[PDB]
Design a binder for these strands. Structure first.
Ligand SMILES: [Mg+2]
Ligand SMILES: [Mg+2]
Ligand SMILES: [Mg+2]
Ligand SMILES: [Mg+2]
Ligand SMILES: [Mg+2]
Ligand SMILES: [Mg+2]
Ligand SMILES: [Mg+2]
Ligand SMILES: [Mg+2]
Ligand SMILES: [Mg+2]
Ligand SMILES: [Mg+2]
Ligand SMILES: [Mg+2]
Ligand SMILES: [Mg+2]
Lengths: 57, 144, 66, 142, 62, 100, 141, 185, 75
RNA sequence: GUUAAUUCCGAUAACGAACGAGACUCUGGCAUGCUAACUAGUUACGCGACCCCGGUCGGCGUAACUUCUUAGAGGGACAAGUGGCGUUCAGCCACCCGAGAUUGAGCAAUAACAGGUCUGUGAUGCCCUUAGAUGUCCGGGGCUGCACGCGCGCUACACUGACUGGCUCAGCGUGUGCCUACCCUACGCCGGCAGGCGCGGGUAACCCGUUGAACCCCAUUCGUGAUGGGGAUCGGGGAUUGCAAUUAUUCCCCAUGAACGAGGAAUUCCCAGUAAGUGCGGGUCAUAAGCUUGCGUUGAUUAAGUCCCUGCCCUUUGUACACA
């Protein structure tokens, strides 16, 4: 998971962007649930700019 | 005319039921069981009685007419719908019951339900609500 | 509560220090001046900047400012 | 000859009153009926007050017919109360000397400002989790 | 004991457990040299007349 | 002859652009055209609970969809109408043509 | 010089009811005294000659806004229906009473069943209505 | 036109305000006179614009309480008008003057608070508001479950408060509060 | 505890005192008439309108809820 | 110090920043200035009807315009100005001019919960059933059962009221469905009534509908009586929907006529078109709101403050806890 998340993070950054965030939540690294978060750059969580400046999947 | 005349009947016993005569006629009649405000107004309109008069203001020559109309409504141009025992189970005739046969017919219908052992009769026998109300949070006052 | 934020105050300060000649005590004049000079997408923010610009211009013309 | 037709709209909570002024005698009526009988008749002075303050001399030279739509009874009567004054001010400002316009505006404003400027108060939206705009349902501890 | 009228000249601030009162500097309208302090219930302004039944007892200052 | 074209769209900017383009095309062809009227906006409002289940504080959403309808009247042969309407159309605007 | 709208309606309806009373050519229904005006009412009307007043009001409403049928009259005369424990809701009036009033006013030459539905008030009824209004204005002043 | 008056009978002038501490808080003279006690409002926006509201309007607003009367201004204006008619017939003098006399008499001059109790003098605005609310409460209490109509249960309360014969509920509560404040000082 | 036994119709003495003292009151309202004569409110209203028909009582205003009557002037 | 804000000023081993807040989007305000309108109107013109030249018409047609109506680009308010407090900084109060000198909502975060949803699913690991089925279909019952306690709500306890007639004003919306079998209603007849029978309008600023809603306003009846308040319980009858109502789906009429005299301990929500009163749309719908989500009408008292109570955040301190 760590290799995949860093790989997609680097690909997005080298593609050209102002901020990236990925969350992987599940039963990885043990049966107990855990969530891993990889963030960098500027991120916007509020306002209508989130409708046309950040895309979520 | 406002002065109270003589022979003022303060209490009139009509159909073995006392009626207070110091109130309006249309609502003094309501003291009799089996007749309400709507029924009394219709009866007092079929009779040539002005509404503003009191139960002690008028004479006894017309009260006999009124009671006969009350006990025989269909004969004085009153339709069947305005009766409380329309299409009676036993005799099958529309009629009005007033404070004497009202309870007798009530227990007659209940006794019929008791005899046939119907669901409504069982609810009446047990003192439980017959119209399907929720007794979980209601009716606690009557049943202890 | 009517408090200008860091964005309004900082932008007003740099605008004044860059165009001190074109600014004065008239709110409406410098409102159009800052509209032509700086690209403020929101007109409400533009009015906030112009209002603080005028207040700072009064402070400058009266005395020093840090 | 000249058509001195003046349109004016006065607004209340939701009601609006469009008063039309032209040349004529001192006849004032709304919806085709005179002011003296407008239910609720209790607030009759709230409609005659623009006439009372300025005098029948000013209204003698102008006849006003107004159309009222929207709002409630109190909203409509306040709407026509505002619109009658606004229509007269507009007529005077546009066809006669403005000194009369200035003096009637000063008298109306010094009496009550609602004669000219409409109140921008509107009903507030209701929100979920409560019966009204600010009110909330009863909290249930335990 | 006479009932006296005093004119408010300065407001000290809120007072009370819930801040339900306002201690206010007040002066009498006959000998304006003499001025005292007193707690006043309800909204107050500067430059209004208050009816004081007792002009001697002094409210605590904070 | 008295053709009437109805445009319904969800985006105000696109609909105004389409109507402006059509009237400009009418101006270029020098045709008598009625002004662009605006029907009142239709706001389909739906309120639902945020929570899939029933627990939690009672929080409600407000999902509204706005539809704008504008119609234009022109006096031209039907061939001209088809020629004008066949070009310069935004995909997000539904088009209706009425002869009467 | 004076029309209905130039005079108060509150006594105008009573004056027209008096006009119908002295006319006496309306052919009132037989069940007038034993009818409830709406499902949302409790008792019979206090006024025993209420039919003349109702006819007067119906004519007044028809003059002000013509083309109103039975359903429109029921909506006009509807009101709160206090269901007891449940809060009240608006309910239309009885259809029969309004329909009989229209037929009674149709028998006399005062209203007319016009085209495109509804009831239209005839000029003869218009003349009677506003001359009653003229009498009201004369009596008041 | 001059001569601004009440509904149809009484003029704003010929009113005497004995207490000079309520000059700016009683609005009846030459600047706030209205033919009706009904106005658009806007007096609850800021803090001290409440005083500028005419005292008859404040009385009319405060009359309607206890749920069933809420949001019924067209009713209380008639109630106040009838009360003005009764007091005019009874006393034979200015109804607004007797209203002012009732308010200045019913208004408490001292009260108790928690800072046991400590005596504090009330603000002139607070005194006016308390009097205009107590007298309505007393009149409503008298009218409740009684044949006598509130259209005079407010009026007789007015004259009783104006006379100060210790019969009005507002006067009785005023003296009770003064007595409590006097003891706790 | 306390109940009022109001008179539905006039006695001879009550009618006489109504004709004597009621017209001399500063205010005349059915509420005060019932209060000080121990009669029904409806009886008070009927008596007041009958006395109005006689023409011995003046009125100032008329309303559905309360109607207020005033006495004759001494002039 | 100040602010709704780690929002700013200001001292300062810190300077520059970023997320959040703020900003922003939607919503209401007002613009006789712009664009426009027979699916909206206004003003005038001509007929038609009526009353003593004039007045009314949502009666009929047409010469101008968009003030009223609808919806688009912009404008507009920013603590802008004055007087005061405030290091004279941030900011606060009052006021003139002014549509406004605090409109409301949405998104809303480094993080946590072993809070709820495996009954939202063709999202899902494991376990279990899998033909005498825990799969599916059919008939019926139940989810409402009532000695009791608790919570969210409706009705009311009445004269500011109830009842009976008259007058009179809105905006939120929806309305013929893919399977789907079920729409919103004008008008004329029958009847008191729900409701039934016929031709019409509407896929909608076009028809219901100028949404003739209530409250409230006007005029009589009631007279302090658990009374014409109150409508619980209950009988008889009459209709609608559904394959089917019995445990009465719902609606209507007559009649029977319970408690409740303003409610203890305790406790809920709120500050301006607010609460409260009142009625109307949508969700559920074959039948349906005593819930909720919104809208409209009337429309106030208090108050521009605090940590007293209750919580909750920051700082200081203590720790043998750190799956805390
Ligand atoms: Mg997981
Ligand atoms: Mg896990
Ligand atoms: Mg941000
Ligand atoms: Mg039942
Ligand atoms: Mg109905
Ligand atoms: Mg934000
Ligand atoms: Mg699958
Ligand atoms: Mg199966
Ligand atoms: Mg009861
Ligand atoms: Mg039963
Ligand atoms: Mg609690
Ligand atoms: Mg220790």
């Amino acid at each position: 998971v760590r290799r995949a998340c860093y790989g997609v993070l680097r690909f997005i950054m080298e593609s050209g962007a102002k901020g990236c965030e990925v969350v992987v939540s599940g039963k990885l690294r043990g049966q107990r649930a855990k969530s891993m978060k990889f963030v960098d750059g500027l991120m916007i969580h509020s306002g209508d700019p989130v409708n046309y400046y950040v895309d979520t999947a | 005319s406002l002065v109270i005349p003589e022979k003022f009947q303060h209490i009139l016993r009509v159909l073995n039921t006392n009626i207070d005569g110091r109130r309006k006629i249309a609502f003094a009649i309501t003291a009799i069981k089996g007749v309400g405000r709507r029924y009394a107004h219709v009866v007092l309109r079929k009779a040539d009685i002005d509404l503003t008069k009191r139960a002690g203001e008028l004479t006894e020559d017309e009260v006999e007419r009124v009671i006969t109309i009350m006990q025989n409504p269909r004969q004085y141009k009153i339709p069947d719908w305005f009766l409380n025992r329309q299409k009676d189970v036993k005799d099958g005739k529309y009629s009005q019951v007033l404070a004497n046969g009202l309870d007798n017919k009530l227990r007659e219908d209940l006794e019929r339900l008791k005899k046939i052992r119907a669901h409504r009769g069982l609810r009446h026998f047990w003192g439980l609500r017959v119209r399907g109300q929720h007794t979980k949070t209601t009716g606690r006052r009557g049943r202890t | 509560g009517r408090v200008r934020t860091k964005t309004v105050k900082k932008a007003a300060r740099v605008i004044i220090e860059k165009y001190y000649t074109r600014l004065g005590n008239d709110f409406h004049t410098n409102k159009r001046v800052c509209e032509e000079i700086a690209i403020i997408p929101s007109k409400k923010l533009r009015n906030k900047i112009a209002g603080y610009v005028t207040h700072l211009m009064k402070r400058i013309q009266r005395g020093p400012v840090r | 000859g000249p058509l001195q037709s003046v349109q004016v709209f006065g607004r209340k909570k939701t009601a609006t009153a469009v008063a039309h002024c032209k040349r004529g005698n001192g006849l004032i009526k709304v919806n085709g009926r005179p002011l003296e009988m407008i239910e609720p008749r209790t607030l009759q002075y709230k409609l005659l007050e623009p006439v009372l303050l300025l005098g029948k001399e000013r209204f003698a030279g102008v006849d006003i017919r107004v159309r009222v739509k929207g709002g409630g009874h109190v909203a409509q009567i306040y709407a026509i109360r505002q619109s009658i004054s606004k229509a007269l001010v507009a007529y005077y400002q546009k066809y006669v000397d403005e000194a009369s316009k200035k003096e009637i505006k000063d008298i109306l404003i010094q009496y009550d400002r609602t004669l000219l400027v409409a109140d921008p108060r509107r009903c507030e939206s209701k929100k979920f989790g409560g019966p009204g705009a600010r009110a909330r349902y009863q909290k249930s501890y335990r | 004991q006479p009932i006296k009228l005093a004119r408010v000249t300065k407001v000290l601030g809120r007072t009370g457990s819930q801040g339900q009162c306002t201690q206010v500097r007040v002066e009498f309208m006959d000998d304006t040299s003499r001025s005292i302090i007193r707690n006043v219930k309800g909204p107050v302004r500067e430059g209004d007349v208050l009816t004081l039944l007792e002009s001697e007892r002094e409210a605590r200052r904070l | 002859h008295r053709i009437r074209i109805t445009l319904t769209s969800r985006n105000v900017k696109s609909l105004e652009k389409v109507c402006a383009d059509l009237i400009r095309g009418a101006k270029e062809k020098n045709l008598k055209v009625k002004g662009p009227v605006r029907m009142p906006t239709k706001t389909l409002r739906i309120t639902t609970r945020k929570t899939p289940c029933g627990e939690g504080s009672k929080t409600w959403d407000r999902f509204q969809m706005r539809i704008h309808k504008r119609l234009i009247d022109l006096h031209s042969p039907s061939e001209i109408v088809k020629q004008i309407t066949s070009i310069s159309i935004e995909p997000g605007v539904e088009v209706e043509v009425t002869i009467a | 010089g004076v029309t209905v709208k130039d005079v108060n309606q509150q006594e105008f309806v009573r004056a027209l009811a008096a006009f119908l009373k002295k006319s006496g050519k309306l052919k009132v229904p037989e069940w007038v005294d034993t009818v409830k005006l709406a499902k949302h009412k409790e008792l019979a009307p206090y006024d025993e000659n209420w039919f003349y007043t109702r006819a007067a009001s119906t004519a007044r409403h028809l003059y002000l806004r013509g083309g109103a049928g039975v359903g429109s009259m029921t909506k006009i005369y509807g009101g709160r229906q206090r269901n007891g424990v449940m809060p009240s809701h608006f309910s239309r009036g009885s259809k029969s009473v309004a329909r009989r009033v229209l037929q009674a006013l149709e028998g006399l030459k005062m209203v007319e069943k016009d085209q495109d539905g509804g009831r239209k008030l005839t000029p003869q009824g218009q003349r009677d209505l506003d001359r009653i209004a003229g009498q009201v204005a004369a009596a008041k002043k | 036109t001059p001569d601004i008056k009440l509904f149809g009978k009484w003029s704003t002038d010929d009113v005497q305000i004995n207490d000079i501490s309520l000059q700016d808080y009683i609005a009846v003279k030459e600047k706030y006179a209205k033919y009706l006690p009904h106005s658009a409002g806007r007096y609850a926006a800021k803090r001290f614009r409440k005083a500028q509201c005419p005292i008859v309007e404040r009385l009319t607003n405060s009359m309607m309480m206890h749920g069933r009367n809420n949001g019924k201004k067209l009713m209380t204006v008639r109630i106040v008008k009838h009360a003005f008619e009764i007091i005019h017939l009874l006393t034979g003098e200015n109804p607004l003057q007797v209203l002012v006399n009732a308010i200045i008499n019913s208004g408490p001059r001292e009260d108790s608070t928690r800072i046991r109790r400590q005596a504090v003098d009330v603000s002139p605005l607070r005194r006016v508001n308390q009097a205009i609310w107590l007298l309505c409460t007393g009149a409503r209490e008298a009218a409740f479950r009684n044949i006598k109509t509130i259209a005079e249960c407010l009026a007789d309360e007015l004259i009783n408060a104006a006379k100060g014969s210790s019969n009005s509920y507002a006067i009785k509560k005023k003296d009770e509060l003064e007595r409590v404040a006097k003891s706790n000082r | 505890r306390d109940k009022l036994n109001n008179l539905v119709l006039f006695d001879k003495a009550t009618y006489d005192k109504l004709c004597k003292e009621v017209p001399n009151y500063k205010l005349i309202t059915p509420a005060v008439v019932s209060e000080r004569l121990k009669i029904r409110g409806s009886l008070a209203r009927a008596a007041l309108q009958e006395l109005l028909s006689k023409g011995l009582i003046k009125l100032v205003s008329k309303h559905r809820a309360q109607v207020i009557y005033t006495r004759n002037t001494k002039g």
